[PDB]
């Protein structure tokens, strides 16, 4: 029967070996190797120019680990012992033991420059400062995963009876605020399928029966997660009470299928690291073992894309075949207009609440608006070529620039749709009247 288990972001199992990765992210990766009755832990960084790679020997069996730009946090799920190591020498390494009950274990941990957090199988939440000064204790469902950004914390929980749920909260300097509290979480579940009893699959679900691979905040501070079906999921509209919703923004299986030439290359897997604008940082793993191997392979990147795609239509349109399959202009324009609209809205929310975090987003936003109207103009011209006046007129309403409507008028004239020309001219006049208000 079911058993709760510990988790660290993007760490691997051992496999048939004496070594594994404990956690991996945009800052670095933590790896360990068995040496007799001890283990050697190495902290490696993707910027060892800022940071320094270092290593030590583990006599405690820290089965949990978390890395940030200030230091590394280590934990033991059974004994309750924890340890924090700043990367600097300005501040000291320190340890503490958490008061676990009989039958309790720590499931995950997290650390930010202002806080340290611990969660357990029996649903106990405990919080401390970066020196170990305690602040509070709270009770939830059994906690199964954790991640944080400055004051924002994103938590996942599971019960046999309440099901799967998540919480989003901020440890504000005035008070702790819940944005969502144990609301249901929509991820796909693998284990019911008998196909998961393949050797490489079975090891992962023994290592991690949840099937999650990692979870993190976006480059704009929005929750993201990568689940058992290898789809990247992002929580949209989380700043809006009546609009917060989960969006499937990238199917890595579809991208592998296309990029392999429309082919079922299940020998390829993706290990997620972090999200930067429209592009995910990840490792492309090859072979039977679905987790990355030793020594660590190199970082890769992939773009988010909307799920418009149909295999049969793309094969027919496409018909050296390993090269990525052709996409029609209609599909490309549709996918672009959806992606441009999504990106513009997410970025708008960022600038309205978080501001320009990087100092160039107004430029990206202007480019996105141009791409949006241009994609709609392609779809508009297609509707006009089909001589569908109503569909073309409805598409004309979606265009933003009056310059776009001028282009639409000229397209309508060449499509020999004078009724559409008249109606678009009425729209242009109405918009100009509205602009004169």
């Amino acid at each position: 029967k079911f058993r709760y288990m510990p988790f660290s972001p993007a760490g691997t199992p051992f496999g048939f070996t004496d070594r594994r990765y404990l956690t991996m992210n945009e800052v670095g990766y933590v790896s360990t190797v068995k040496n007799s009755e001890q283990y050697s832990i190495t902290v490696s960084f993707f910027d060892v120019g800022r940071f320094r790679e270092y290593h030590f020997e583990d006599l405690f069996g820290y089965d949990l680990c978390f890395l940030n730009e200030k230091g590394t946090l280590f934990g033991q799920s059974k004994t309750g012992q924890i340890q924090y190591r700043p990367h600097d020498s300005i501040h000291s390494n320190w340890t503490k033991i958490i008061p676990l009950q009989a039958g309790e274990r720590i499931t995950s941990v997290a650390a930010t420059p202002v806080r340290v957090i611990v969660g357990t199988s029996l649903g106990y939440f405990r919080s401390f400062n970066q020196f170990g000064v305690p602040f509070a204790v709270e009770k939830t469902s059994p906690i199964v995963a954790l991640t944080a950004q400055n004051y924002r914390v994103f938590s996942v929980h599971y019960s046999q009876f309440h099901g799967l749920s998540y919480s989003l909260s901020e440890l504000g300097t005035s008070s702790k605020r819940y944005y969502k509290r144990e609301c249901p979480l929509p991820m796909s579940l693998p284990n019911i399928n008998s196909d998961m009893k393949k050797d490489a699959n079975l090891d992962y679900y023994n290592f991690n029966p949840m099937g999650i691979k990692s979870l993190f905040f976006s480059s704009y501070g929005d929750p993201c997660i990568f689940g058992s079906d290898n789809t990247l999921l992002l929580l949209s509209k989380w700043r809006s009470p009546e609009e917060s919703k989960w969006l499937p923004i990238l199917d890595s299986n579809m991208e592998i299928w296309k990029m392999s030439g429309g082919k079922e290359t299940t020998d390829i897997h993706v290990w997620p690291l972090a999200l930067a604008y429209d592009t995910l940082n990840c490792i492309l793993v090859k072979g039977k073992h679905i987790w990355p191997e030793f020594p660590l392979p190199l970082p890769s990147e992939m773009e988010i894309r909307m799920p418009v795609f149909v295999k049969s239509k793309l094969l027919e349109e496409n018909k050296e075949e390993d090269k990525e399959i052709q996409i029609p202009v209609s599909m490309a324009a549709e996918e672009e207009y959806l992606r441009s609209k999504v990106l513009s809205e997410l970025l708008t929310d960022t600038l309205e609440n978080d501001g320009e975090m990087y100092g160039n987003e107004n430029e990206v936003l202007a480019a996105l608006n141009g791409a949006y109207d241009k994609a709609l103009l392609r779809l508009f011209a297609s509707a006009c070529s089909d001589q569908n006046v109503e569909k073309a007129l409805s598409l004309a309403h979606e265009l933003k620039q009056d310059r776009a409507l001028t282009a639409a008028v000229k397209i309508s004239e060449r499509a020999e749709l004078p009724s559409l020309v008249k109606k678009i001219n009425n729209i242009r006049e109405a918009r100009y009247e509205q602009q004169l208000k």
């Binding site: 109207d373 241009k374 103009l377 392609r378 011209a381 070529s385 310059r403 776009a404 282009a407 000229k410 397209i411 060449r414």
Partner: peptide, 10 residues
């Protein structure tokens, strides 16, 4: 027709 989208590009 693409030339009009070229105008919208220019």
């Amino acid at each position: 027709f693409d030339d009009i989208l070229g105008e919208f590009e220019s």
